[PDB]
């Protein structure tokens, strides 16, 4: 498999995932200024801006490593926030809508 078409696919997939995050609540790292306790139990924060930087640093060389960091965005949010919050439900919705995006992208990758 060739590297450039694969990264082109990951770039498109990342854009499709960001489109599902309409509030842009996962676009950038969680502000530790407003959430000073966030690192107490979130051992690896993740967000789409960080994912873009990892992508361009050639840190995602297979679909699973890309998908793992997306799942981290979701799982961090479910962990930190109470179930009755907008944040928690936004993570549920992203898990649902992003899973469909990821399944189609992986089918495209496996054709390579
Ligand atoms: C991910 C999401 N972002 C955020 C921004 C500002 C305050 C708290 C949060 N908590 C979150 O989980």
Swiss-Prot record:
Disulfide bonds: none annotated. High levels in testis. Acetylated by KAT6A. Residues 1-105 form the Bromo domain. It is found in: Nucleus; Chromosome; Cytoplasm. It is linked to Intellectual developmental disorder with dysmorphic facies and ptosis: An autosomal dominant neurodevelopmental disorder characterized by delayed psychomotor development, intellectual disability, delayed language, and facial dysmorphisms, most notably ptosis. Additional features may include poor growth, hypotonia, and seizures. Component of some HBO1 complex composed of KAT7/HBO1, MEAF6, ING5, and BRPF1. Component of the MOZ/MORF complex composed at least of ING5, KAT6A, KAT6B, MEAF6 and one of BRPF1, BRD1/BRPF2 and BRPF3. Interacts (via PHD-type zinc finger domains) with unmethylated histone H3 at 'Lys-4' (H3K4me0). Interacts with trimethylated 'Lys-36' of histone H3 (H3K36me3). Interacts with ING5; interaction directs BRPF1 to H4K4me3-enriched chromatin at the 5' of active genes. Interacts with KAT7. Scaffold subunit of various histone acetyltransferase (HAT) complexes, such as the MOZ/MORF and HBO1 complexes, which have a histone H3 acetyltransferase activity. Plays a key role in HBO1 complex by directing KAT7/HBO1 specificity towards histone H3 'Lys-14' acetylation (H3K14ac). Some HAT complexes preferentially mediate histone H3 'Lys-23' (H3K23ac) acetylation. Positively regulates the transcription of RUNX1 and RUNX2. This is Peregrin. It comes from Homo sapiens (Human). The gene is BRPF1.
């Amino acid at each position: 498999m060739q590297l450039t078409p694969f990264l082109i696919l990951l770039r498109k997939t990342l854009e499709q995932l960001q489109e599902k995050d309409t509030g842009n609540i996962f676009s950038e790292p969680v502000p530790l200024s407003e959430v000073p306790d966030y690192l107490d139990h979130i051992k690896k924060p993740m967000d789409f801006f960080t994912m873009k930087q990892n992508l361009e640093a050639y840190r995602y060389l297979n679909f699973d490593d890309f998908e793992e960091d997306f799942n981290l965005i979701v799982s961090n949010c479910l962990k930190y926030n109470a179930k009755d919050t907008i944040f928690y439900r936004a993570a549920v919705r992203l898990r649902e809508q992003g899973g469909a995006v990821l399944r189609q992208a992986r089918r495209q990758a496996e054709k390579m």
